[PDB]
Scaffold this active site. Structure first.
Site, PDB file in Angstrom:
ATOM      1  N   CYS A  11       0.729  -1.271   0.000  1.00  0.00           N
ATOM      2  CA  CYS A  11       0.000   0.000   0.000  1.00  0.00           C
ATOM      3  C   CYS A  11       0.760   1.325   0.000  1.00  0.00           C
ATOM      4  CB  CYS A  11      -1.095   0.010   1.081  1.00  0.00           C
ATOM      5  SG  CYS A  11      -0.578  -0.024   2.792  1.00  0.00           S
ATOM      6  N   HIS A  35      -3.262   0.861   6.544  1.00  0.00           N
ATOM      7  CA  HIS A  35      -3.406   0.877   5.098  1.00  0.00           C
ATOM      8  C   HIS A  35      -3.145   2.312   4.645  1.00  0.00           C
ATOM      9  CE1 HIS A  35      -4.472   0.287   1.060  1.00  0.00           C
ATOM     10  NE2 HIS A  35      -5.649   0.882   1.127  1.00  0.00           N
ATOM     11  N   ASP A  56      -7.178   5.723  -4.110  1.00  0.00           N
ATOM     12  CA  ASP A  56      -6.408   4.549  -3.686  1.00  0.00           C
ATOM     13  C   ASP A  56      -5.998   3.649  -4.844  1.00  0.00           C
ATOM     14  OD1 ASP A  56      -5.364   2.239  -2.432  1.00  0.00           O
ATOM     15  OD2 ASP A  56      -6.744   2.454  -0.736  1.00  0.00           O
TER      16      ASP A  56
END
Ligand SMILES: [Ca+2]
Ligand SMILES: [Ca+2]
Ligand SMILES: [Cl-]
Ligand SMILES: [Mg+2]
EC number: 2.3.2.13
Length: 675
Positions: free
Chosen positions: A272, A330, A353
């Site tokens: 991530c 995250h 994202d």
């Protein structure tokens, strides 16, 4: 003779300075929409009264005046709306022309041509090319950011900080965005000509490039190699042969250059924060104010019910069934622009994202999601509101499962553990900016609960024993791991507790790797009594299964007759041995600076295959790789190397030290380069 151009002076330095694009290590003409720039045109003769000059700018494979990907404008005087050119002065055969574009023009690479109407005929010539970007400085541009310092951090800053770790130990790692480095802007621009959208319909894709929402969503897809030959290939297994350990990267620069250099083959591998760092680079380079966000205890709801399940067996073993449904943390991004598609109240920070978690319209892309909207639970708006809301505010349900019986039984429901210490780098410094209050109303408040219900409605219309796991001492790779399970009997009776414990090495997302310790025990406790059961895990036991995350999952399932099990959880982080960077003199631009890498081996065995990776925009060009010799037990390695500063100010030096026993040890050093 007919009127014709002899040469054109783009006054590149001057215009780029005025358009805040002078930091890019590039010789091209880089501009921002809605702002005008001045050029000097030397004609062969004077501009006649009956003559006319018409500019023609075009972008993409299908320049269309209708789609705004092509504009034709005459050299007038009264500055027009969209594209325009004003003759501010005539000296000899030299025309001083001010050209302007619309604040709504598509971003990207354009070409400029000139059409001349002279002596009854027409002639055309190409003047050249330029790059047009979003203008965060222009009050009418949708990416407008009025505050000076904020805009400087979210657009002009190429050195960054990304928080990681856990809710028990928040840490940070340096990251080199390097949006100004050689060829980076070019590559980030090329990404748009390589997306699924562009291949689907190039004419419409290029036209839509005037929308930060569109550009933003495309980038969230194109940064991961899923579905479209994107940039990064994710890997959360703890084994990265065939590529690089995700933890070893220090910036977005080497990744983007590797992507291009390999014929756009996936860069292996990322996690991530790697996707977010790389995305942040593209966003800042294109002109969209952007920052990196870290959400601790990030949930991954896989069926939109605002709830996540985690299971354990009676022996205290975490089951794969949900071990990664709630990541320790995250990382994603926030883009700053208005939401003309949602309304005045939803403008601002927009979640983006690139990490391939949930598919959106069949593709791994995510956002833009208005942070404001997420806090109010308006998950009906685009894009991917449902998923993101769950990430920060989903309920956690703990289950017990006995495969031997098939029986499954709920243990507890926690409505406040998901979405904590949501952090981002403070403007102008490395301090941690907590923005939890921006994504959700206060845990334990009625609002928080009212919004939860609101959001869930849009989607689908006592114990006597208390336990706690405390870390006893120092936790470092090389040292034994020492914990203690504290249990207390809150009942008026004497209870006998059966305890089953396990210790598993994991990847920060929750991916179970290997059990490294287990044990059972029964302790009797009188009313109000407190007892401690020591948990000792030797280096020998975990060293073989510990990954670069340096994390271990500790669990203890305890139970007393006639009472529901009590589950105690704790993820621990072992520190890598220290890695140090030192400058041996005053740092001045264009002057050699002596630096030193220091590392001492704490193990009783030597470390081999030692490699040092150093980089830092403004401090050195690209990445520096050094092969350090085998380091014996308890010995120190001292590596020398010089860096050559190219830009003054506060710079960030980053290094990665990898060897067989310690993958991805990190270091960071702030250096003030003087002029
Ligand atoms: Ca992709
Ligand atoms: Ca909550
Ligand atoms: Cl470039
Ligand atoms: Mg679910």
């Amino acid at each position: 003779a007919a009127l014709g151009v002899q040469s054109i002076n783009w006054q590149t330095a001057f215009n780029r300075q005025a358009h805040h694009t002078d930091k890019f290590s590039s010789q091209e003409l880089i501009l921002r929409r809605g702002q005008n720039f001045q050029v000097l045109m030397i004609m062969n003769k004077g501009l006649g009264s009956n003559e006319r000059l018409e500019f023609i700018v075009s972008t993409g494979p299908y320049p269309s005046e209708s789609a705004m990907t092509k504009a034709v404008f005459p050299l007038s005087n009264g500055s027009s709306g969209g594209w325009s050119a004003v003759l501010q002065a005539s000296n000899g055969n030299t025309l001083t022309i001010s050209i302007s574009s619309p604040a709504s023009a598509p971003i990207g690479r354009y070409t400029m041509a000139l059409q001349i109407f002279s002596q009854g005929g027409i002639s055309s010539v190409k003047l050249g090319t330029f790059i047009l970007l979003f203008n965060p400085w222009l009050n009418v541009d949708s990416v407008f950011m009025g505050n000076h310092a904020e805009r400087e951090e979210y657009v002009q800053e190429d050195a960054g900080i990304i928080f990681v770790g856990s809710t028990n130990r928040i840490g940070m790692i340096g990251w080199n965005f390097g949006q100004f480095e050689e060829d980076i802007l070019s590559i980030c621009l090329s990404i748009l000509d390589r997306s699924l959208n562009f291949r689907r319909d190039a004419a419409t894709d290029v036209a839509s490039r005037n929308d930060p929402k569109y550009v933003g969503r495309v980038l969230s897809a194109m940064i991961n190699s899923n579905d479209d030959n994107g940039v990064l290939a994710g890997n959360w297994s703890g084994t990265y042969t065939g590529g690089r350990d995700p933890r070893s990267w220090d910036g977005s620069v080497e990744i983007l250059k590797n992507w291009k250099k390999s014929g756009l083959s996936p860069v292996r591998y990322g996690q991530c924060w790697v996707f977010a760092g790389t995305l942040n680079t593209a966003l800042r380079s294109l002109g969209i104010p952007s920052r990196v966000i870290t959400n601790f205890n990030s949930a991954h709801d896989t069926d939109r019910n605002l709830s996540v399940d985690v299971y354990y067996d009676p022996m205290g073993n975490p089951l794969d069934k949900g071990s990664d449904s709630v990541w320790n943390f995250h990382v994603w991004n926030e883009g700053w622009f208005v939401r003309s598609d949602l309304g005045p109240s939803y403008g601002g920070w927009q979640v983006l994202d690139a990490t391939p978690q949930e598919r959106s319209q069949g593709v791994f892309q995510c956002g833009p999601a208005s942070v404001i909207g997420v806090r109010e639970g308006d998950v009906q708006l685009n894009f991917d509101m449902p998923f993101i809301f769950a990430e920060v505010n989903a309920d956690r349900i703990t289950w017990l499962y006995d495969n031997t019986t098939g029986k499954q039984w709920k243990n507890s429901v926690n409505s406040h553990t998901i979405g904590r210490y949501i952090s981002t780098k403070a403007v102008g410094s490395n301090a941690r900016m907590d923005v939890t209050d921006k994504y959700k109303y206060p845990e334990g408040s009625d609002q928080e609960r009212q919004v939860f219900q609101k959001a869930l409605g849009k989607l689908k219309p006592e114990p006597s024993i208390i336990g706690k796991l405390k870390v006893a001492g120092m936790l470092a790779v090389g040292k034994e791991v020492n914990l203690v399970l504290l249990l207390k009997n809150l009942s008026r009776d004497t209870k006998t507790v059966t305890v089953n414990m396990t210790a598993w090495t994991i990847i920060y997302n929750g991916t179970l790797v290997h059990e490294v310790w287990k044990d059972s025990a029964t302790m009797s406790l009188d009313p109000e009594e407190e007892a401690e059961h020591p948990i000792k895990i030797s280096y020998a036991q975990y060293e073989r299964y510990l990954k670069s995350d340096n994390m271990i999952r500790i669990t203890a399932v305890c139970k007393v007759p006639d009472e529901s099990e009590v589950v105690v959880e704790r993820d621990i982080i072992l520190d890598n041995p220290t890695l140090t960077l030192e400058v041996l003199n005053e740092a001045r631009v264009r002057k050699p600076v002596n630096v030193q890498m220091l590392f001492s081996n704490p193990l009783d065995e030597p470390v081999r295959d030692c490699v040092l990776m150093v980089e830092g925009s403004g401090l050195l060009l690209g990445n520096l790789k050094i092969d350090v010799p085998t380091l014996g037990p308890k010995e120190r390695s001292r590596v020398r190397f010089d860096i050559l500063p190219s830009r003054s100010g506060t710079k960030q030096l980053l290094a990665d030290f990898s060897c067989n026993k310690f993958p991805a040890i990190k270091a960071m050093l702030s250096i003030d380069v003087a002029e």
